[PDB]
Design an enzyme around this catalytic site. Structure first.
Site, mmCIF file in Angstrom:
data_model
loop_
_atom_site.group_PDB
_atom_site.id
_atom_site.type_symbol
_atom_site.label_atom_id
_atom_site.label_comp_id
_atom_site.label_asym_id
_atom_site.label_seq_id
_atom_site.Cartn_x
_atom_site.Cartn_y
_atom_site.Cartn_z
ATOM 1 N N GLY A 75 -0.883 11.406 -13.831
ATOM 2 C CA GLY A 75 0.333 11.532 -14.641
ATOM 3 C C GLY A 75 0.787 12.961 -14.881
ATOM 4 N N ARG A 102 -14.981 13.340 -9.610
ATOM 5 C CA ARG A 102 -14.484 14.396 -10.544
ATOM 6 C C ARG A 102 -15.501 15.459 -10.899
ATOM 7 N NH1 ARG A 102 -10.794 10.632 -14.337
ATOM 8 N NH2 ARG A 102 -8.928 10.962 -13.065
ATOM 9 N N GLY A 133 -1.912 8.192 -9.012
ATOM 10 C CA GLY A 133 -3.157 7.458 -9.016
ATOM 11 C C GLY A 133 -3.339 6.524 -7.855
HETATM 12 N N1 LIG Z 1 7.353 -4.433 -3.185
HETATM 13 C C1 LIG Z 1 6.599 -4.320 -4.279
HETATM 14 N N2 LIG Z 1 6.549 -5.228 -5.261
HETATM 15 C C2 LIG Z 1 5.766 -5.133 -6.351
HETATM 16 N N3 LIG Z 1 4.959 -4.103 -6.612
HETATM 17 C C3 LIG Z 1 5.003 -3.154 -5.627
HETATM 18 C C4 LIG Z 1 5.751 -3.166 -4.481
HETATM 19 N N4 LIG Z 1 5.543 -2.025 -3.704
HETATM 20 C C5 LIG Z 1 4.660 -1.365 -4.430
HETATM 21 N N5 LIG Z 1 4.262 -1.990 -5.582
HETATM 22 C C6 LIG Z 1 3.078 -1.676 -6.426
HETATM 23 O O1 LIG Z 1 3.246 -0.297 -6.861
HETATM 24 C C7 LIG Z 1 2.043 0.004 -7.597
HETATM 25 C C8 LIG Z 1 1.745 1.520 -7.510
HETATM 26 O O2 LIG Z 1 2.869 2.129 -8.178
HETATM 27 P P1 LIG Z 1 2.731 3.481 -8.989
HETATM 28 O O3 LIG Z 1 1.860 3.100 -10.108
HETATM 29 O O4 LIG Z 1 4.022 3.950 -9.610
HETATM 30 O O5 LIG Z 1 2.097 4.512 -7.952
HETATM 31 P P2 LIG Z 1 1.308 5.956 -8.322
HETATM 32 O O6 LIG Z 1 0.127 5.589 -9.094
HETATM 33 O O7 LIG Z 1 0.833 6.343 -6.964
HETATM 34 O O8 LIG Z 1 2.336 6.807 -9.015
HETATM 35 C C9 LIG Z 1 0.876 -0.718 -6.910
HETATM 36 O O9 LIG Z 1 0.205 -1.532 -7.894
HETATM 37 C C10 LIG Z 1 1.629 -1.719 -5.898
HETATM 38 O O10 LIG Z 1 1.198 -3.078 -5.708
HETATM 39 MG MG LIG Z 2 -0.142 3.960 -10.535
#
Ligand SMILES: Nc1ncnc2c1ncn2[C@@H]1O[C@H](COP(=O)(O)OP(=O)(O)O)[C@@H](O)[C@H]1O
Ligand SMILES: [Mg+2]
Length: 394
Positions: A374, A36, A351
């Site tokens: 976010g 960062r 993230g």
């Molecule tokens: N099939 C699944 N079952 C449980 N958790 C899942 C599955 N596929 C993805 N995830 C989980 O999704 C999480 C990331 O989701 P999210 O926080 O919404 O993504 P971002 O931060 O990229 O917006 C990771 O911790 C990952 O393990």
């Molecule tokens: Mg996330």
């Protein structure tokens, strides 16, 4: 788009309050990842070169409106000086006479880092009195922290009611790329939405459905949709209370003419562990006592084919539990398809999604990796971020 930047104002000899994002990970008082700090250099170097008296302001962690010794910005000031190869002055407060004396002692091209703004309870409440104390220190306000612009805080919004306010270079890149994806996308336009819970993505899916040509779903999110279609999902993540919402989204896709894709195969495991027994099954045959943790081989192929026929792709959320190597293949396959698609522009937000791409070593093959976390998702929902609205229009 349409906001004035530091290139649109003369900064020579002016006191410039610059909100930056220096919220870096630390262990034992040492920075473990300076990404960062590095991301802020272009803005900072431009200001120095053009003769501004540069006043930097950032938050670090969550002090909750009081001094937390371990969350002081000394380590960051140190690291910034190394990267700039010029001393950086640093105060132990962010307002007050000691700070006024330090700003007064700055010459053109000098840099001063104020103490963690979240040490003050008026910061997160957006107190006008704290906002005015900040504004008293400068002539101009520059907002280069897109990841903090989604909340109205004294340093990210309040201060902009009292001084001319412009965007730094990182802020400008986020607004141009994200702004264009929502307002004038290149087509075919495909959005790929993954992650854990549909609860977390309701606003993004709702808004993107008004714009995309194709919508692809993966991650744990997808099992709520599969259940909505009448299939058992075994022990997979499911939000039973959102089944009707899932059917509304599929009906909205039909009405809008959007091609809706969901997994045709999955990788199931008998236990939640990297060394679990696993197998590949079609989506309509998930064992009642197994869990689907990743998209299967045929689904990776299908998603790659849709990506290859799109001109713009927006991706938010891992396709499986990529934290475990046995369930990271589906996520990797999407990153590699984007890296290899010659005429497809790629935008990544979130993230975990940014982390996943970095982890696979493909970050430089993408067109844009959002820094906002976010704030990028809220922007994609169609929300008006308070820190963005406060900036002047060109
Ligand atoms: N099939 C699944 N079952 C449980 N958790 C899942 C599955 N596929 C993805 N995830 C989980 O999704 C999480 C990331 O989701 P999210 O926080 O919404 O993504 P971002 O931060 O990229 O917006 C990771 O911790 C990952 O393990
Ligand atoms: Mg996330």
């Amino acid at each position: 788009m349409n906001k004035k930047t530091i290139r649109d104002v003369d900064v020579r000899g002016k006191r410039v309050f610059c909100r930056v994002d220096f919220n870096v990970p630390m262990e034992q008082g040492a920075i473990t990842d300076d990404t960062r700090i590095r991301a802020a250099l272009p803005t900072i170097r431009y200001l120095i070169e053009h003769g501004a008296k540069v006043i930097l302001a950032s938050h670090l962690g969550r002090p909750k409106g009081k001094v937390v010794e371990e969350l002081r910005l000394d380590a960051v000031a140190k690291r910034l000086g190394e990267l700039l190869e010029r001393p950086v002055a640093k105060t132990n407060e962010a307002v007050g006479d000691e700070v006024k004396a330090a700003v007064d002692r700055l010459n053109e091209g000098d840099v001063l880092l104020l103490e963690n703004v979240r040490f003050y309870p008026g910061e997160e409440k957006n107190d006008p009195e704290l906002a005015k104390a900040f504004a008293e220190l400068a002539d101009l306000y520059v907002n280069d922290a897109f990841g903090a612009a989604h909340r109205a805080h004294a340093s990210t919004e309040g201060i902009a009611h009292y001084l001319p306010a412009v965007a730094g270079f990182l802020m400008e890149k986020e607004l141009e790329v994200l702004g264009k994806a929502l307002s004038n996308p290149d087509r075919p336009f495909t959005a790929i939405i993954g992650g854990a819970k549909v609860k977390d993505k309701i606003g993004v899916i709702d808004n993107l459905l008004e714009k995309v040509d194709n919508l692809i779903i993966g991650g744990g999110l997808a099992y709520t949709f599969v259940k909505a279609l009448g299939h058992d999902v075994g022990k997979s993540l499911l939000e039973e209370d959102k089944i009707e919402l899932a059917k509304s989204f599929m009906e909205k896709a039909k009405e809008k003419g959007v091609r809706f894709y969901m997994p045709v195969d999955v990788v199931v495991a008998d236990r939640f562990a990297n060394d679990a027994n696993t197998k590949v099954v079609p989506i309509d045959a998930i064992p009642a006592d197994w869990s689907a943790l990743d998209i299967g081989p045929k689904t990776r192929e299908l998603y790659r084919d849709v990506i290859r026929e799109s001109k713009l792709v927006v991706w938010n959320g891992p396709m499986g539990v990529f934290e475990m190597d046995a369930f990271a293949h589906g996520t990797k396959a999407i990153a590699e398809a984007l890296a290899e698609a010659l005429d497809t522009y790629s935008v990544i937000g979130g993230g975990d999604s940014a982390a996943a791409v970095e982890k696979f070593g493909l970050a430089d093959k993408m067109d844009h990796i959002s820094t906002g976390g976010g704030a990028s998702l809220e922007f994609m929902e169609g929300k008006q971020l308070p820190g963005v609205v406060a900036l002047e229009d060109k």
